[PDB]
Amino acid sequence: LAAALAEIYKGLAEYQARLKSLEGISPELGPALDALRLDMADFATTMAQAMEEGLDSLPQSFLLKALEQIRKIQADAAALREKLAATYKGNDRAAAAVEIAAQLEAFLEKAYQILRHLAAA
């Protein structure tokens, strides 16, 4: 349980580091960058809080919250990738972002499987 939770949290943190390393879209997109940071930070807050507490069992609300939330984040990220690519392309930074994005997709799949198992009785 703790070990599993540790693995997921670690992976998320690493991805964040890559998402800063690439930045520089536009200043006017302040709310944009804030949205991405709020979604990721929120996931880390709730997850980290539960692990620290070490409660006997987690609530059904918590489970379904993880599934619906993460799905929302993936959809929004996809839209951002399409727009960003159209604007920025060819540059080395753009190519790297594509590579990183691909890795995230695989990780997303694995995470979905784990959550489904937990939700299922």
**What's 2-33 look like in SS3?**
HHHHHHHHHHHHHHHHHHHHCCCCCHHHHHHH
Across 43-72, b (16+ Cβ under 10 Å) vs e yields: beeebeeebeeeeeeeeeeeeeebeeeeee
PDB experimental method: NMR
Beta carbons of 4 and 114 less than 8 angstroms apart: yes
Alpha helix stretches (DSSP H) within the chain = 2-21, 30-53, 60-87, 92-119
Those residues with Cβ within 8 angstroms of residue 66's Cβ, 6 or more apart along the chain or in another chain: 43, 47, 115
Beta carbons of 118 and 59 less than 8 angstroms apart: no
